[PDB]
Amino acid sequence: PEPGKKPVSAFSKKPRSVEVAAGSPAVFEAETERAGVKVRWQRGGSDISASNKYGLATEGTRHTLTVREVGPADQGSYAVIAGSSKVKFDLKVIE
Amino acid sequence: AALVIDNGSGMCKAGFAGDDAPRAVFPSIVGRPRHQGVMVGMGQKDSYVGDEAQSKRGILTLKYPIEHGIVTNWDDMEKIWHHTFYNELRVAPEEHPVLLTEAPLNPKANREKMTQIMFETFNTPAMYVAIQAVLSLYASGRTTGIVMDSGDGVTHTVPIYEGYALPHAILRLDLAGRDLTDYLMKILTERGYSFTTTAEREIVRDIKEKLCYVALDFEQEMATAASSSSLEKSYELPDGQVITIGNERFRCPEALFQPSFLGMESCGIHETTFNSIMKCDVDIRKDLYANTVLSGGTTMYPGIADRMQKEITALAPSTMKIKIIAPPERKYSVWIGGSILASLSTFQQMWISKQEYDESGPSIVHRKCF
Amino acid sequence: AALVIDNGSGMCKAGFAGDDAPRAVFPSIVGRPRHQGVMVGMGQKDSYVGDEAQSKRGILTLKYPIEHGIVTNWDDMEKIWHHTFYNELRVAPEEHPVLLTEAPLNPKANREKMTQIMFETFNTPAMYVAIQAVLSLYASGRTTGIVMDSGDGVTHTVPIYEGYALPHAILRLDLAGRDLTDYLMKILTERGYSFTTTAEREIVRDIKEKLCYVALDFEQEMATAASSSSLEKSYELPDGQVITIGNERFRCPEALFQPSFLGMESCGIHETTFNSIMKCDVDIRKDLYANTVLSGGTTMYPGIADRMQKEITALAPSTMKIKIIAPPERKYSVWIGGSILASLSTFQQMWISKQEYDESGPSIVHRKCF
Amino acid sequence: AALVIDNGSGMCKAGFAGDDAPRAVFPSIVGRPRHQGVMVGMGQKDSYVGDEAQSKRGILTLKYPIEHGIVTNWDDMEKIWHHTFYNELRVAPEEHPVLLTEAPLNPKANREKMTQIMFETFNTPAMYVAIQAVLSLYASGRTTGIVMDSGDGVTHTVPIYEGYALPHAILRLDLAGRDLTDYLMKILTERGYSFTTTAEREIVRDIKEKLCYVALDFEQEMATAASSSSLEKSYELPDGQVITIGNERFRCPEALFQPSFLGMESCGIHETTFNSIMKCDVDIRKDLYANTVLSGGTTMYPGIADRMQKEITALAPSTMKIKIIAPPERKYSVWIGGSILASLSTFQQMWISKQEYDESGPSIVHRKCF
């Protein structure tokens, strides 16, 4: 059987998988139980940072990731790490 | 993500970091009409850039922005970069750090000027200059070996042992596919076909890429070319002219193997790889021979791996097996290495910051990286 | 249980007391990156310890922690000890007393510092420093005799009679297998082969261990060396290079017998054994000659016992028979002595306590042990 | 009279014994026309020998008969010898004994074969092979000292005290001016200038011989290289190309001092001289430091004596003054030593006779001379 309860985690809300069309904008919302900690985002094999093409919005305990250039390239998996907590989610793109 | 641009000879490869294949592949050429045009209603398009030039190649006088890994004219390069950023990529330079891949033992001026243009002409928070031999190795997925990297411009060999490098052991060779193209055009004239213009110069190169192949034994094919049947093929030009080649196609790739036809003292590609091995430490030599990796545009022709294997095995000791790995699409391996290289967490810390440039100066590139 | 560590030149032997064979045998070497590495995805690993270094020997520059029975750098020794306690032994220093063995007439600083590091760096209730000549004798199982102890460090002779030792009768000789290796590398260069690197330095030593042998008479084989039929063999290096040697192989072992080639006044091993005997009392001399025991790394080559027997018999009186006991695995005899020595109950009381060190001071080592 | 010929790396020096300067100095090179010749007035001279080759260096392919004191091709050497005895000396080999000079710890085959050809190919009643360190000392005129002999082949150190020499104190170093030339050519490529041909290989060496000098401090000059004024000079090639060099020329001689640039573990010339001194006995060491003599091809650059003097004085005790003697034209000192060495009456008895060679064999060379 499964353990039952996971080790203490830093995410209040886990980002959930969604589906996006090619050229269609994509927005992900994630939340953390504790504030004051930077949240790092990872794309299938490449890290995501607060720079253009990608958008990071950090308000209080809420972190938002926005991708407007998402296409066939982005098909894969995304990982997000807040402090010591490891979590990942899948993005689906249809041609 | 991140942006990766390969500014090699004749072709500009552009794409996004983390992607297995680049978004934009097109020749780095600018074509202008040498001769006055005759027609009514033509837009008279003075400048042609990219693959458009390839279609209208006969009328246009093609010019290469990059010669021997050196860029002759900076504005043409900007048009190329502009074309890659806003055409096929459809992204802004501001958005991500930009990774450029450079061949081993390249001049100091090229790295300093290249970074200066990227910091000034295209504003980006950071950039990094990579080395082709190490990036090719990553595509291979092997920690230890010797990498022979032959681009469209200059062939280079860079051995590597478990991540440690030997700068003395690295050897630069002046033999390349572009050189073969010049030899090739020179060889065609004796037969009775002459090409003296850059625009038709590409036509012989095109012939070389698919029609040309490497003979198991040079002397035997020449001997059997007297009664050629399957040795001759007909190539159709966009112009409409018909070209028939025979023993001529296989003796061209041969020159890399046999520089004597060229008239130069320097040894061929198999001897040079051997020389690089000799430079390297004796202990690490034994797995160097079995870990040989082929890369670049001039390694595409079939039979190269088989000819190299027999030649390396005979020259080298017989106490160990000789293995050569030559995967397909090795031409694009250098660009691929750039996309994978920018995909490592450790690597992002390593990028050359704008602040560091402003304080320390342009000369810090050699200090910071190989 | 108990922990026994033999810190001899070239190799570190570690194991558990009461065991007939040590758990961890590896060379005592520390490797650092001579050249900067250019790849991303490595932990860099600036320091390498043990057999790992042997695999990555070419890039790394090997450094020996112990020279002539003296340790040049203490931290490197810790890394070796750390490696032996956790990597192969898989035990904690706290758990048992630790026995170390040291060669005769060794400098004061090495015993005091060695105990200081063992008491401070690795916490243990007690430790003991022993002498190699006496431990070898116990392995032999003989109460009376003369012990010739030669390692890869410094050759030492320590005669013993019915449990009592003579300090004035102990002679230290500066000849050793490592010294032979330096002579050997020097001798190879005249022939036409040159080794100037520490990594390949080991390779000549490897050759010496199995290819080299002791000639019954140096002059006669050299005389017949002009026409070599069976005196030449082919040795294969990891490099792939092929080496053939003739009279060169037997002349190296000869140097211990005939130091004149080295360029030093001091007499060879047979003369030195004789000199040690002369120092000792005349009454106990008679069973010293028949009780000769050979030990250490440089006594490995076959025929040494046979050459020594005839030479000692010739120089020594004929009134008594000469017997030399030189059993195989004498190289590991010193370590073996350490494991057996720790085994005795009486011995455990004799170990230098942590409490004694703190109160009396470091100078008590000489005061307690010999 | 008598004939003295120096068959060293890169050139052949010939002259008459008893003369302060040789009659014939030219490079030891053979050149052939690699390129087909299309001219209206040539005899198509296929082979060129000597200084004639130097003028026509670009068209010709130059091959060195001697590599590391080893002759690759015997006929070319014969042509050189024929040229030296007849063209400038205008004398017959039969007429006088001939003296040749050889570096320490050179292979057995070189002395035996060299004597064999001198006795057979050129008929002479007797010949002798000398050691460079002892002859250089005679030019100096000092009975005691340490001789650092660095030719165009291999750097050697041979200390001597009041007529007696220590074979174990003689150390061979693998650094040489020719090696520097290879390093230099490798260095030029990073600046954007590339030389991959033997004919132009000489041109960088020519630059090095007069343009290059030894910096008081390597790091300080590199720092001031940014605002170079007097640092950069221009060199004119026979081809017509113009070469400009700055901090690049003085950083080459530095490598002998600092091998780390080369990538080799072995220490520089000042450390090696020190090591040789350590090998030597303690009593004779004190006048060894004050009697240091510099000789050979790579010791030519100004400031070497001053940099070594400060470095030797710093490392060595200050209780004794350190004096280094570096007279001009020390490159030709070895040849000069050969002419003076043959001059002495005692020396004539010492020459290896033809009769002795036939009666015993080539192997007697080691038996007779050092």
Swiss-Prot record, chain A:
Put simply, this protein is called Myosin-binding protein C, cardiac-type
Name the encoding gene, please. MYBPC3
Which residues are annotated with the PTM Phosphoserine?
Answer: S46
User: What's this protein's function?
Assistant: Thick filament-associated protein located in the crossbridge region of vertebrate striated muscle a bands. In vitro it binds MHC, F-actin and native thin filaments, and modifies the activity of actin-activated myosin ATPase. It may modulate muscle contraction or may play a more structural role.
Please report the PTM annotation for this entry.
Answer: Substrate for phosphorylation by PKA and PKC. Reversible phosphorylation appears to modulate contraction. Polyubiquitinated.
Q: Which family does it belong to?
A: Belongs to the immunoglobulin superfamily. MyBP family.
Query: Highest taxon of the source?
Result: Eukaryota
Q: Which source organism?
A: Homo sapiens
Q: Which disease is it linked to?
A: Cardiomyopathy, familial hypertrophic, 4: A hereditary heart disorder characterized by ventricular hypertrophy, which is usually asymmetric and often involves the interventricular septum. The symptoms include dyspnea, syncope, collapse, palpitations, and chest pain. They can be readily provoked by exercise. The disorder has inter- and intrafamilial variability ranging from benign to malignant forms with high risk of cardiac failure and sudden cardiac death. Cardiomyopathy, dilated, 1MM: A disorder characterized by ventricular dilation and impaired systolic function, resulting in congestive heart failure and arrhythmia. Patients are at risk of premature death.
UniProtKB/Swiss-Prot annotation, chains B, C, D:
Q: Entry's Pfam families?
A: Actin
Q: Where is this cross-link: (Microbial infection) Isoglutamyl lysine isopeptide (Lys-Glu) (interchain with E-270)?
A: K45
- List Tele-methylhistidine occurrences by residue: H68
- Chief place of localization: cytoplasm
Q: Which residues cross the membrane?
A: none
Q: Which residues carry this modification: Methionine (R)-sulfoxide?
A: M39, M42
Glycosyltransferase listed as a keyword: no
GO terms of biological process kind: angiogenesis; axonogenesis; cell motility; cellular response to type II interferon; maintenance of blood-brain barrier; morphogenesis of a polarized epithelium; platelet aggregation; positive regulation of cell migration
Alphabetically, the GO molecular function entries are:
ATP binding; hydrolase activity; identical protein binding; profilin binding; protein kinase binding; structural constituent of cytoskeleton; structural constituent of postsynaptic actin cytoskeleton; ubiquitin protein ligase binding
**Where does it live in the cell?**
Cytoplasm, Cytoskeleton
**Which reactions are catalysed by this chain?**
ATP + H2O = ADP + phosphate + H(+)
Query: Which UniProt keyword terms apply here?
Result: Acetylation, ATP-binding, Cytoplasm, Cytoskeleton, Deafness, Disease variant, Hydrolase, Intellectual disability, Isopeptide bond, Methylation, Non-syndromic deafness, Nucleotide-binding, Oxidation
Question: What positions does the cross-link (Microbial infection) Isoglutamyl lysine isopeptide (Glu-Lys) (interchain with K-50) connect?
Answer: E265
**What does the UniProt record tell us about how this protein is modified after translation?**
Oxidation of Met-39 and Met-42 by MICALs (MICAL1, MICAL2 or MICAL3) to form methionine sulfoxide promotes actin filament depolymerization. MICAL1 and MICAL2 produce the (R)-S-oxide form. The (R)-S-oxide form is reverted by MSRB1 and MSRB2, which promote actin repolymerization. Monomethylation at Lys-79 (K84me1) regulates actin-myosin interaction and actomyosin-dependent processes. Demethylation by ALKBH4 is required for maintaining actomyosin dynamics supporting normal cleavage furrow ingression during cytokinesis and cell migration.
Q: Which residues belong to the signal peptide in this entry?
A: none
N6-methyllysine: residues bearing it: K79
GO cellular-component term (any): extracellular space
Which CDD domains does the record match to this protein? Answer: ASKHA_NBD_actin
Complex formation: Polymerization of globular actin (G-actin) leads to a structural filament (F-actin) in the form of a two-stranded helix. Each actin can bind to 4 others. Interacts with TWF1, CAPZB, cofilin and profilin.
Q: Which disease is this protein implicated in?
A: Deafness, autosomal dominant, 20: A form of non-syndromic sensorineural hearing loss. Sensorineural deafness results from damage to the neural receptors of the inner ear, the nerve pathways to the brain, or the area of the brain that receives sound information.
The family line of this record is: Belongs to the actin family.
Q: What functional role does this protein have?
A: Actins are highly conserved proteins that are involved in various types of cell motility and are ubiquitously expressed in all eukaryotic cells. May play a role in the repair of noise-induced stereocilia gaps thereby maintains hearing sensitivity following loud noise damage.
Miscellaneous comment text of the record: In vertebrates 3 main groups of actin isoforms, alpha, beta and gamma have been identified. The alpha actins are found in muscle tissues and are a major constituent of the contractile apparatus. The beta and gamma actins coexist in most cell types as components of the cytoskeleton and as mediators of internal cell motility.
Q: What is this protein called?
A: Actin, cytoplasmic 2
Q: What is the lineage of its organism?
A: Eukaryota, Metazoa, Chordata, Craniata, Vertebrata
Q: Which gene encodes it?
A: ACTG1
